[PDB]
Design a binder for this molecule. Structure first.
Ligand SMILES: Nc1ncnc2c1ncn2[C@@H]1O[C@H](COP(=O)(O)OP(=O)(O)O)[C@@H](O)[C@H]1O
Lengths: 77, 364, 57, 76, 44
């Protein structure tokens, strides 16, 4: 379930007491919080700085075209 | 840790769930019943076990507390018998049904502070807690329990009372309906003891068919949908189309002589009562909760039925958490554990300062 | 005071640039081009603008 | 900042494919420019406009510059 | 599909965490990214 998935993610990031504390921190962060063009902008910055790597990233995005996931990834980056 | 454990108590029409905030599951679950001889008062499983020599009372039969004397006894039982804690030593988060009368909220508050002397307390709507457990603050929750079902639209953490719908059709009705059709099959399930057996058959072998008629045709021309069930005395019985005919009543209440709309139509009607600007958020976030939503196949059936009612351009998504049977309690455990929620508790100090009516401001 | 003087100078420079563009021949497009030119090349920007105009046609 | 400005310019000119092409193109003195502009004006002729352009160039200096002039010359 | 997503993630910047994140996304995205950053800070 969604609750089980959140617990699994916390375990990967991380004995039992420490895991509970990490889960509480994750829940607090979620409460506090409560696409293609963006990828292209990141590629342009890479090209300015390299060019071959930027071309590969553009090709991978085209193959993928999920969106939400991509956005998340971008944010992380 | 400086703080003692906070308690989470989910008051259910049929079963109460109790435990400690921070835990992943309730520590105890027991029948919302109090019994007295036909030890002076019996509560929970014991009342059920010795029902033969008792007169049973159901103080929260349809989600709303109707007898506070017995509800107080259920809470006493919860603290001292089930959780083995002293309420005056722990903050307590309680759950309430959607559309709970304002006066009832004040009564619950007064009882916690004056009768149990809780150091702090809070009351949250059941459906809202289930939504929280799914990681959302916006969406519509279809909560189907034992004695009542509700469709509750929630936006930004706030339930929308004007759009909430109550359906007096839930697990209890389905159990009795199964007893009726199994009896029509040639068996005989009519007694209170037999009701418990059928409730078990219901929870273990029933399912929601994707298409009622097709499923009926399959069961009529073959034995492919039949399942065996063994009674305690060894007799093995067969359950056929009753497996899906039972929960079908949720979608077609007429099978029970009820004119009410099915759960799919009720969910749709609630959404239509909300501001047009948030309806798409509700359609894309329809969350199922409660024991009666545990039937295999119910999520796909809801998806199909809602899609038929909503505009063809609408994105429909039904969320059915594997742990939805206890999502209310789990949502309470999550909420009571939040850093930002600590300032939200009603303290004994605040209660002494403003009285019972403070609950309306503190627990909006 | 100093900020107001800077704003007046920027407005005067933009007006002069617009007059030069009219002679060699909008204002919003020129402002975006001027900001890009200041950052950093010029020949490449002209080629991109010509291609965009062809696509619009 | 520069990427955002380029996206805004593409939007004003007009989508995602065009923006990607512009990004790829992006990834790929003053006295001389003024003389070239005067020569272009002479070819167009006309003479009066060239005199006005010289006065305008002096005004801009009174109130980087080479790059802006080159872009204007390319548009012609 | 999942392998292609992993390659894109590597260029932007483990595999098990990405799979768990993808499942959560399938089951908002900006909030999830903030939670991951907070967890990393807590681990530090
Ligand atoms: N797996 C299941 N399938 C179908 N019904 C179930 C299942 N598990 C429990 N139930 C039914 O769910 C009801 C209790 O659910 P619950 O949400 O706890 O209700 P409440 O809060 O009103 O007491 C009972 O009618 C029970 O028979």
């Amino acid at each position: 379930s969604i609750t089980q998935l959140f617990d699994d993610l916390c375990e990967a990031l991380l004995r039992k007491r420490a895991k509970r504390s990490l889960k509480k921190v994750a829940y607090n962060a979620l409460f506090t919080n409560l696409a293609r063009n963006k990828i292209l902008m990141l590629s342009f910055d890479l090209r300015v700085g390299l060019g071959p790597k930027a071309d590969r990233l553009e090709e991978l995005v085209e193959e993928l075209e999920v969106g939400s996931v991509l956005d998340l990834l971008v944010q992380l980056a | 840790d400086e703080e003692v454990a906070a308690l989470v108590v989910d008051n259910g029409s049929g079963m109460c769930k109790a435990g400690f905030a921070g835990d992943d599951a309730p520590r105890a679950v027991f029948p919302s019943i109090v019994g007295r001889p036909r030890k002076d008062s019996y509560v929970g499983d014991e009342a059920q076990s010795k029902r033969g020599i008792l007169t049973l009372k159901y103080p929260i039969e349809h989600g709303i507390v109707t007898n506070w004397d017995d509800m107080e006894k259920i809470w006493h039982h919860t603290f001292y018998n089930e959780l083995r804690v002293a309420p005056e030593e722990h903050p307590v988060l309680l759950t309430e049904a959607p559309l709970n009368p304002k006066a009832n909220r004040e009564k619950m508050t007064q009882i916690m502070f004056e009768t149990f002397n809780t150091p702090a307390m809070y009351v949250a709507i059941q459906a809202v807690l289930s939504l929280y457990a799914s990681g959302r603050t916006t969406g519509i929750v279809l909560d189907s329990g034992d004695g009542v079902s509700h469709t509750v639209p929630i936006y930004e953490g706030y339930a929308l009372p004007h759009a909430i719908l109550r359906l007096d059709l839930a697990g209890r009705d389905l159990t009795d309906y199964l007893m009726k059709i199994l009896t029509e099959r040639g068996y005989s399930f009519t007694t209170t003891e037999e009701r418990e057996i059928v409730r078990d058959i219901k929870e273990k072998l029933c399912y929601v068919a994707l298409d009622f008629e097709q499923e009926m045709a399959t069961a009529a021309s073959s034995s492919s949908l039949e399942k065996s069930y063994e009674l305690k005395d060894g007799q093995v019985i067969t359950i056929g189309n009753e497996r899906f005919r039972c929960p079908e009543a949720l979608f077609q209440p007429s099978f029970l002589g009820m004119e009410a709309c099915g759960i799919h139509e009720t969910t749709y009607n609630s959404i239509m009562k909300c501001d047009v600007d948030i309806r798409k958020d509700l359609y894309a976030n329809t969350v199922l909760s409660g024991g009666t939503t545990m039937y295999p196949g119910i999520a796909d059936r809801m998806q199909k039925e809602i899609t038929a009612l909503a505009p063809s351009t609408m994105k429909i998504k039904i969320i059915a958490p594997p742990e939805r049977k206890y999502s209310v309690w789990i949502g309470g455990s999550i909420l009571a554990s939040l850093s930002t929620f600590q300032q939200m508790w009603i303290s004994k100090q605040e209660y002494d300062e403003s009285g019972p009516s403070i609950v309306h401001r503190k627990c909006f | 005071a100093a900020a107001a003087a800077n704003l007046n100078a920027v407005r005067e420079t933009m007006d002069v640039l617009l007059e030069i563009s009219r002679i060699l021949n909008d204002m919003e497009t020129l402002s975006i081009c001027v900001r890009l030119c200041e950052q950093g090349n010029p020949e490449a920007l002209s080629s991109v603008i010509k291609e965009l105009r062809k696509a619009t046609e | 900042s520069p990427n955002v400005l380029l996206q805004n310019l593409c939007c004003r000119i007009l989508v995602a494919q065009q923006f990607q092409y512009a990004v790829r193109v992006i990834g790929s003195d003053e006295f001389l420019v003024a003389e070239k502009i005067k020569k272009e004006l002479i070819r167009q002729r006309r003479e009066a406009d060239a005199a006005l352009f010289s006065e305008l160039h002096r005004k801009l200096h009174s109130q980087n510059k080479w790059s802006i002039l080159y872009l204007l010359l390319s548009l012609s």
